[PDB]
UniProtKB/Swiss-Prot annotation, chain B:
Compartments (UniProt record): Mitochondrion inner membrane
Pfam families: MWFE (PF15879)
Subunit organization: Complex I is composed of 45 different subunits.
Protein's UniProt name: NADH dehydrogenase [ubiquinone] 1 alpha subcomplex subunit 1
Gene that this polypeptide is encoded by: NDUFA1
Swiss-Prot record, chain C:
Stretch of the intact protein here: 6 to 48 of 144
Disulfide bonds: none
Bilayer-spanning residue ranges: 25-43
Family: Belongs to the complex I NDUFA13 subunit family.
Top-rank taxon: Eukaryota
Stated name of the protein: NADH dehydrogenase [ubiquinone] 1 alpha subcomplex subunit 13
Subunit structure, as described in the record: Complex I is composed of 45 different subunits. Interacts with CARD15, but not with CARD4. Interacts with STAT3, but not with STAT1, STAT2 and STAT5A. Interacts with OLFM4.
Protein's cellular compartments: Mitochondrion inner membrane; Nucleus
Native source organism of the sequence: Bos taurus (Bovine)
Signal peptide: none
Chain's gene name: NDUFA13
Function: Accessory subunit of the mitochondrial membrane respiratory chain NADH dehydrogenase (Complex I), that is believed not to be involved in catalysis. Complex I functions in the transfer of electrons from NADH to the respiratory chain. The immediate electron acceptor for the enzyme is believed to be ubiquinone. Involved in the interferon/all-trans-retinoic acid (IFN/RA) induced cell death. This apoptotic activity is inhibited by interaction with viral IRF1. Prevents the transactivation of STAT3 target genes.
Swiss-Prot record, chain D:
Locations listed in the record: Mitochondrion inner membrane
Gene from which the chain derives: NDUFA12
InterPro entries given in the database record: NDUFA12
Protein name: NADH dehydrogenase [ubiquinone] 1 alpha subcomplex subunit 12
Description of how the protein assembles with itself and partners: Complex I is composed of 45 different subunits.
Protein family according to the UniProt entry: Belongs to the complex I NDUFA12 subunit family.
UniProtKB/Swiss-Prot annotation, chain E:
TM helices/strands, residue ranges: 1-20, 68-88, 98-118, 144-164, 170-190, 203-223, 234-254, 275-295
Source organism of this protein record: Bos taurus
Subunit relationships: Core subunit of respiratory chain NADH dehydrogenase (Complex I) which is composed of 45 different subunits.
Assigned GO CC terms: mitochondrial inner membrane; respiratory chain complex I
Reaction equations catalysed: a ubiquinone + NADH + 5 H(+)(in) = a ubiquinol + NAD(+) + 4 H(+)(out)
The organism's taxonomic lineage, starting at the top: Eukaryota, Metazoa, Chordata, Craniata, Vertebrata
Family: Belongs to the complex I subunit 1 family.
Protein's name according to its UniProt entry: NADH-ubiquinone oxidoreductase chain 1
Role according to the record: Core subunit of the mitochondrial membrane respiratory chain NADH dehydrogenase (Complex I) which catalyzes electron transfer from NADH through the respiratory chain, using ubiquinone as an electron acceptor. Essential for the catalytic activity of complex I. Essential for the assembly of complex I.
Major location (coarse): mitochondrion
Length: 147, 64, 43, 138, 296, 88, 176, 88, 53
C-alpha cells in the first residue's frame, strides 16, 4: 500500500543521507581522493566521513590501478563488507585501465574482480567530477524495494 | 558561520537541559512543597520515620 | 604580447621566522601566577 | 557591532521571499544568500550571482523545478545549466545573455538534455562494420 | 517514576547529536563545513544514522562465541547509563550514601566492555590489539582514583551534594591548580582517540560518546558550580549547561589538534611523569587541612 | 556574533599577527577571462635570411669515440660557507 | 649555501633553563598549539556548495571528448588517423572510408573511456581542430556500454556543448 | 528504589541488542607487569580511601605520620620500578 | 634511456627513490617499535608509485 511505499523511501533516505567509505589508496588517484577532504570541494558537507572504518564501511571507492598482486587482496575485503554495498571505480585505471591496459600485470578495470555500480571516468578525477561519485550515487538510489 | 554551529549547541541546550529540569519539576507532583529529603545518616531517617507517624500516615513529607 | 612584470615588495620568508613570544613568557613570572593562584586558593 | 550583523541576517531573509521564501531556499539549497540576479536561462534557472562574498564567487545557480520532466524540487544535481557554465559559473567574466552571447551555428540543440543514467534514453555502443557478404541462392 | 525514562531517551539524543557537533566544530577547526545537505543545518542526520546502521545494515559473524558478542554491549550501554543516576543535577535521582565511590566503581567496571569484545573475535590479532587498548584504560584509572581522593580531601565527603556547597564563591580549579591540568588529561582514558586509538559498530561507541559527556559533567561539578540557589533550580541548570558544553568543546579540541602519543610513550607519561607528580600533590593535600584548619 | 570588527581582534590575539592575507584570499586582483588576445613572439628563426639548418646543427655531433682500450675526474668539490641571511 | 638545523643546547644558566623547564612541568606549548587552531576557527570556511556554486576552471581544460564541426554543417574530421598514432593509451579506434561523393571522412570512431588518460594530445595533434576537449564532468554511468563512446553518434551529441567549445577555443589560437 | 533504577537501564540496553540482531533481514609477557603494578597500587589507594572521611574525628598528630607513610611506600615501590622497568 | 636509430626507446629505467629508501628499512627498524615504523615511512616519504622500476 501507500504506507509501505513511503516507508521504503525512508530506508532509502537513510543511505542517501549518509555513506561511509573505505577508500583504497594504491594510486595517483588517491591524492584526488584526498582532495575530497580539502575544504574547497567539501564532502563532509554530506553524510560522508573520512573515518574509513574497514569492517563497518558501506561504499568502497576503488581508486586507480589494480595489479595481479592486489587482485586477491581487494576481493577478500569486498566479501567482508555489509550487504548494502556499492563500488565506485575512481579514475580511468579503475574503469578499464587508462594506461597499462595492454600490460601483463594489470587487471583490465576492476569489473573482472569486483562488480562496479558507478564509474568515475577522469584520470586525475577532478573534485568536480568526483562529486558525481557521491551525488549521482545518491540520485541512483531508488531501488524500488516492493516486497 | 555561527548560524550553523550554534543550532548544534542550541539542540544540546534542550536535550541535555531536560535531566536538570525533569528532576526538579517532578517534586511538585510528589510533594506539596517541592522537596524530597535524603537520609545519609540514621538520625535524619528517624526524623522521616516520625514524620510518617505524625498526621499523615502514608505521606512522608507533611506540615505539622 | 605575453610578458611578466616583477611586482616584488614583500617576497616572503627569506629564512625568516614569525615564531614570537606571546601572552608573556614564563621563567619566573608564570610560576608567581601559579603559586599565587594556590595561595589565593587555600586562603 | 553585533546588532549590525543581526540586522544583515534579517534583511537577507526579507530579500529572498520571506517566511516561505527563505525556508524554501534552506531546504533545497545548502545555504541561503542574497545577491544580484542574471535571470535569463532556458527552463527557469535563477543563477543569482555577481556578489563579492568569498573565494570563487559566482554564487547560487539555483536549479529549475522540472527542467524536462524530472520534477527536481527535493533532489537536484549539476545536470542543469544549459550552455552558460563556462562564463556565469566557472571561467569567463561576462554574463552569457547580458554582455557576450554565443554565436549561432544552426546545428546545436535548442533544448539541453539531462544526465544520462539508468533511466531510458541512455548511451549504447555500435559498430560501422558492413561485414563480408556470403552468397548462397537456389 | 518517570524520571529514569527522562534520563535515558533525552540522554541518548545528546549522544546522537554529539556526532554533529564532533563533525561541525572539528570541521570549522579544519576550514571545511559541517553537514548541510541533510537538513536545515544538518540537524536531521543523527536520526538518519540511526535508521542506516540499525535496520538494514547486517552483521557478518567472525565466529560468534555463543554467550559473548551479545553480552559486551550490555556491559557497554548499560553501565554508561547507570553513571547518570547519582549525578547532583539540582536534586539527584535517589541520592547515594557515597556519591563518588559509585562513580569510580562503575567507570572501572566499564573496562570489561572492551575486554569481552576482545574475546568476541576468534582471531589472535584482535585480542592482542584489544589488550593494548585495555592497558591504556587500566593505567589511567590509578590517577583517576588519586586526583579524586586529593580533591575531596580539601573539602567535602564522598557525597556529590556536598561538592556543590564548597563552591559557594570559589571554584576548586584555583586551590587544585596542578590537579586541574592533571584531571583533564586523565579523563582521556576510555578510548578517547585524542591520546591513542586501538554487537554492531553503531551502539558500541554510543556508550563511548556517553562516557565523554559523563566526564564533562563530572568536571563541571568537581571543578565548576558557581552557586546552588535552592529558590530557583532554573538559574543553576542554564548556567550548568554552558559550563559543561565549554568542556565538551575542549575534548573536541584535543582530538582535532594533537596526534597519537606512541603507545609506549603514553605508558611513559604515566608512572614516570604523571604518578611522581600526583603522589607529591597527594602528599601535599594530606598536610593542607592539618596545616590550616579545614576538615569538614 | 559574525561581525568582522570584533572577530579580527580575537584571531590577532591568539598566536601571531593575522588581519591581512585571509584563508580564502580570492577577493581582489583575480583576473577573470585572463586578458585581451595577445601576440606570441618569435625566436631567433622566423625572420628570413641566414636561417640555414647547416648552421643550426641540433643533432649532428653525437658519435662516441672509443678511448685507449695521476688524474682526477674534476677539481674536488670544495665546501660552501654558511648562509649570510641565517646562520642557524 | 649551508643552513644548519640543530641549535646545540640554547640553555645555559637560571633564566634560559627554567623557562625551557616550564614547558615540561606545565604545558604552555599546548596553549600555543591551541592558539593557532583558535584563530583558524574564527576565520570563514572556504567551502563550495557543489550543485549551486562551482569551482574555478581554465579557458583551456581537458575532460570531455567531443568532435566539432564547421558553422555551415559538415563534419570537420577528415580520418587522418593522426590522433590515433599520438594517442598514448591507444584508446581512439578509427576506420576510414570514402563517403561516395568525393569527400574522405569517417565511419567508425570509438574513443573508449575505459582507456584514455585525458592527456589532450589528440586535441593538439589534430590539424583541422576536430577533437576539442569540452569542459565537462557530467558523464558518470552505470555500465561500460554507457561509458565508452560510440562511432560519432555520442560525440556529435557534443554539439550540445559546442556553444562553450567555440568560446573556449578563442584562447587556443594565439595561445593564451 | 535502587533496583528499579538499575533494571530499567539494563532492560532497555538489552532491548537495543534485540533491535540490532533480530530486525535485519537479508604472547608478549611484558604487558603482564602493567596488570601487576595496577592491582598492587589499587590496595594502597583502598587503604588511602578513608582520608576525607576519618580525618573529621580522629587525632591529627597520629594520622598525619601514618597517612603520608602510605604514600611514601607507594613512591618507594615506584623508586624500585625505575631501575630497569621495560621498553613498553 | 637506451636508444637506437629508430623513434622507439628500447628499455628506459627510472630508479626512483623508492628502491633506495625501502632498502634502508632493514637498518632503520632495528631496535624500534611498531609505531616507530609508521614514522619512518612518512619522513622518508615512501610514495608507493616510486616502485615501478
Ligand atoms: N537443488 C534444488 O533445490 C532443486 C532440486 C530439483 C529441481 N530444482 C529446480 O531448479 C531450479 C533452481 O532454482 P532455485 O530454486 O535455486 O531458485 P531460487 O533460489 O528459489 O530463486 C528464484 C529466483 O527467481 C525469481 N523468480 C522465481 N519465480 C518467479 C516468478 N514467478 N516471477 C518473477 N520472478 C521469479 C525470484 O526473484 P524475485 O524474488 O524477484 O521474484 C528469485 O530470485 C528450480 O526452478 C527448480 O524447479 C532445484
Ligand atoms: S586513472 Fe590516472 S591518476 Fe588514477 S591511478 Fe590511473 S594513471 Fe593514476
Ligand atoms: S580528429 Fe583530427 S587528426 Fe583525428 S582523424 Fe579527425 S581530422 Fe584527423
Ligand atoms: S586525450 Fe590523450 S589518451 Fe585520451 S584519446 Fe586523446 S590522445 Fe588518446
Amino acid at each position: 500500500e501507500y504506507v509501505v511505499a513511503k516507508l521504503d523511501d525512508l530506508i532509502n533516505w537513510a543511505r542517501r543521507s549518509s555513506l561511509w567509505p573505505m577508500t583504497f589508496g594504491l594510486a595517483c588517484c588517491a591524492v584526488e581522493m584526498m582532495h575530497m577532504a580539502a575544504p574547497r570541494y567539501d564532502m563532509d558537507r554530506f553524510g560522508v566521513v573520512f573515518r574509513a572504518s574497514p569492517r563497518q564501511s558501506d561504499v568502497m571507492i576503488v581508486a586507480g590501478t589494480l595489479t595481479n598482486k592486489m587482485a586477491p587482496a581487494l576481493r577478500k575485503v569486498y566479501d567482508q563488507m555489509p550487504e548494502p554495498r556499492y563500488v565506485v571505480s575512481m579514475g580511468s585505471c579503475a574503469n578499464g585501465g587508462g594506461y597499462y591496459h595492454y600490460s601483463y600485470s594489470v587487471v583490465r578495470g576492476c569489473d573482472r574482480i569486483v562488480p562496479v555500480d558507478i564509474y568515475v571516468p577522469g584520470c586525475p578525477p577532478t573534485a568536480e567530477a568526483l562529486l558525481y561519485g557521491i551525488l549521482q550515487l545518491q540520485k541512483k538510489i531508488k531501488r524500488e524495494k516492493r516486497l | 558561520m555561527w548560524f550553523e554551529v550554534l543550532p548544534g549547541i542550541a539542540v544540546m541546550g534542550v536535550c541535555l537541559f531536560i535531566p536538570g529540569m525533569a528532576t526538579a519539576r517532578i517534586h511538585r507532583f510528589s510533594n506539596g512543597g517541592k522537596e524530597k529529603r535524603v537520609a545519609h545518616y540514621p538520625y535524619q531517617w528517624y526524623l522521616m520515620e516520625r514524620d510518617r507517624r505524625v498526621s499523615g500516615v502514608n505521606r512522608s513529607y507533611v506540615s505539622k | 604580447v605575453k610578458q611578466d612584470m616583477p611586482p616584488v615588495g614583500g617576497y616572503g620568508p627569506i629564512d625568516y621566522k614569525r615564531n614570537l613570544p606571546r601572552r608573556g613568557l614564563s621563567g619566573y613570572s608564570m610560576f608567581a601566577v601559579g603559586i599565587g593562584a594556590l595561595l589565593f586558593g587555600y586562603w | 557591532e553585533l546588532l549590525q550583523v543581526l540586522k544583515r541576517g534579517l534583511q537577507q531573509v526579507s530579500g529572498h521571499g520571506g517566511l516561505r521564501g527563505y525556508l524554501r531556499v534552506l531546504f533545497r539549497a545548502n545555504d541561503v544568500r542574497v545577491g544580484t540576479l542574471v535571470g535569463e536561462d532556458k527552463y527557469g534557472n535563477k543563477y543569482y550571482e555577481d556578489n563579492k562574498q568569498f573565494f570563487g564567487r559566482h554564487r547560487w545557480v539555483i536549479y529549475t523545478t522540472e527542467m524536462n520532466g524530472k520534477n527536481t524540487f527535493w533532489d537536484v544535481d549539476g545536470s542543469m545549466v544549459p550552455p552558460e557554465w563556462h562564463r556565469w559559473l566557472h571561467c569567463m567574466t561576462d554574463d552569457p545573455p547580458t554582455v557576450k552571447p554565443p554565436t549561432a551555428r544552426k546545428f546545436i540543440w535548442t533544448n539541453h538534455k539531462f544526465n544520462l543514467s539508468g533511466t531510458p534514453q541512455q548511451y549504447v555502443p555500435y559498430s560501422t562494420t558492413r561485414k563480408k557478404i556470403q552468397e548462397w541462392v537456389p | 517514576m518517570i524520571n529514569i525514562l527522562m534520563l535515558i531517551i533525552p540522554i541518548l539524543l545528546a549522544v546522537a547529536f554529539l556526532t554533529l557537533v564532533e563533525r561541525k566544530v572539528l570541521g570549522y577547526m579544519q576550514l571545511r563545513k559541517g553537514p548541510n545537505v541533510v537538513g536545515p543545518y544538518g540537524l536531521l542526520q543523527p536520526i538518519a544514522d540511526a535508521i542506516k546502521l540499525f535496520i538494514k545494515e547486517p552483521l557478518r559473524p567472525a565466529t560468534s562465541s555463543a554467550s559473548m558478542f551479545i553480552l559486551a554491549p550490555i556491559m557497554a550501554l548499560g553501565l554508561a547509563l547507570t553513571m547518570w543516576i547519582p549525578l547532583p543535577m539540582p536534586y539527584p535521582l535517589i541520592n547515594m550514601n557515597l556519591g563518588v565511590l559509585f562513580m569510580l566503581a562503575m567507570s572501572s567496571l566499564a573496562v570489561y566492555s572492551i575486554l569481552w569484545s576482545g574475546w568476541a573475535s576468534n582471531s589472535k590479532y584482535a585480542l592482542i590489539g584489544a589488550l593494548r587498548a585495555v592497558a591504556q584504560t587500566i593505567s589511567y584509572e590509578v590517577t583517576l582514583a588519586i586526583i579524586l581522593l586529593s580533591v575531596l580531601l580539601m573539602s567535602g565527603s564522598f557525597t556529590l551534594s556536598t561538592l556543590i556547597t564548597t563552591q559557594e564563591q570559589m571554584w576548586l580549579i584555583l586551590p587544585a591548580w596542578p590537579l586541574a591540568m592533571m584531571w583533564f588529561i586523565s579523563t582521556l582514558a576510555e578510548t578517547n582517540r585524542a591520546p591513542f586509538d586501538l554487537g554492531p559498530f553503531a551502539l558500541f561507541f554510543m556508550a563511548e560518546y556517553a562516557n565523554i559527556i559523563m566526564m564533562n559533567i563530572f568536571t563541571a561539578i568537581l571543578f565548576l558550580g558557581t552557586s546552588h540557589n535552592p529558590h530557583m533550580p532554573e538559574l543553576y541548570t542554564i548556567n550548568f549547561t554552558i559550563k559543561s558544553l565549554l568542556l565538551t568543546m575542549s575534548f573536541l579540541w584535543i582530538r582535532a589538534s594533537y596526534p597519537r602519543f606512541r603507545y609506549d610513550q603514553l605508558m611513559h607519561l604515566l608512572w614516570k611523569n604523571f604518578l611522581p607528580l600526583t603522589l607529591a600533590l597527594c602528599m601535599w593535600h594530606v598536610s593542607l587541612p592539618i596545616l590550616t584548619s579545614g576538615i569538614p | 556574533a559574525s561581525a568582522t570588527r570584533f572577530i579580527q581582534w580575537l584571531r590577532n590575539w591568539a598566536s601571531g599577527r593575522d588581519l591581512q592575507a585571509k584563508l580564502q584570499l580570492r577577493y581582489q586582483e583575480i583576473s577573470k577571462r585572463t586578458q585581451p588576445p595577445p601576440k606570441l613572439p618569435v625566436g631567433p628563426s622566423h625572420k628570413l635570411s641566414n636561417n640555414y639548418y647547416c648552421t643550426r646543427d641540433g643533432r649532428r655531433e653525437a658519435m662516441p669515440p672509443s678511448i685507449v682500450m695521476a688524474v682526477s675526474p674534476a677539481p674536488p668539490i670544495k665546501r660552501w660557507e654558511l648562509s649570510q641571511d641565517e646562520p642557524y | 649555501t649551508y643552513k644548519y638545523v640543530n641549535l646545540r643546547e640554547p640553555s645555559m644558566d637560571m633564566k634560559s633553563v627554567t623557562d625551557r623547564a616550564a614547558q615540561t612541568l606545565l604545558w604552555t606549548e599546548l596553549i600555543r598549539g591551541l592558539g593557532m587552531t583558535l584563530s583558524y576557527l574564527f576565520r570563514e570556511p572556504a567551502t563550495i556548495n557543489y550543485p549551486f556554486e562551482k569551482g574555478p576552471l581554465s579557458p583551456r581544460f581537458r575532460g570531455e571528448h567531443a568532435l566539432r564541426r564547421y558553422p555551415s554543417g559538415e563534419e570537420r574530421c577528415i580520418a587522418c588517423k593522426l590522433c590515433e598514432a599520438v594517442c598514448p593509451a591507444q584508446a581512439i579506434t578509427i576506420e576510414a572510408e570514402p563517403r561516395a561523393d568525393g569527400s574522405r571522412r569517417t565511419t567508425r570512431y570509438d574513443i573508449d573511456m575505459t582507456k584514455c588518460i585525458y592527456c589532450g594530445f589528440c586535441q593538439e595533434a589534430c590539424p583541422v581542430d576536430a577533437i576539442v576537449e569540452g569542459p565537462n564532468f557530467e558523464f558518470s554511468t552505470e555500465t561500460h556500454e554507457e561509458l565508452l563512446y560510440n562511432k560519432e553518434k555520442l560525440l556529435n551529441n557534443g554539439d550540445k556543448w559546442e556553444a562553450e567549445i567555440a568560446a573556449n577555443i578563442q584562447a587556443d589560437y594565439l595561445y593564451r | 528504589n535502587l533496583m528499579l533504577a538499575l533494571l530499567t537501564n539494563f532492560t532497555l540496553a538489552t532491548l537495543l541488542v534485540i533491535i540490532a540482531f533480530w530486525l535485519p533481514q537479508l604472547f608478549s609477557m611484558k604487558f603482564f607487569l602493567v596488570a601487576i603494578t595496577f592491582l598492587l597500587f589499587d590496595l594502597e589507594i583502598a587503604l588511602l580511601l578513608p582520608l576525607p572521611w576519618a580525618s573529621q574525628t580522629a587525632n591529627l598528630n597520629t594520622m598525619l605520620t601514618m597517612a603520608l607513610f602510605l604514600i611514601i611506600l607507594l613512591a618507594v615501590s615506584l623508586a624500585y620500578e625505575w631501575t630497569q622497568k621495560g621498553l613498553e | 634511456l637506451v636508444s637506437d636509430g629508430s623513434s622507439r626507446p628500447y628499455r628506459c629505467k627510472i630508479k626512483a627513490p623508492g628502491f633506495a629508501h625501502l632498502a634502508g628499512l632493514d637498518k632503520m627498524s632495528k631496535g624500534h617499535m611498531l609505531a616507530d615504523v609508521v614514522a619512518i615511512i612518512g619522513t622518508q616519504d615512501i610514495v608507493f608509485g616510486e616502485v615501478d622500476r
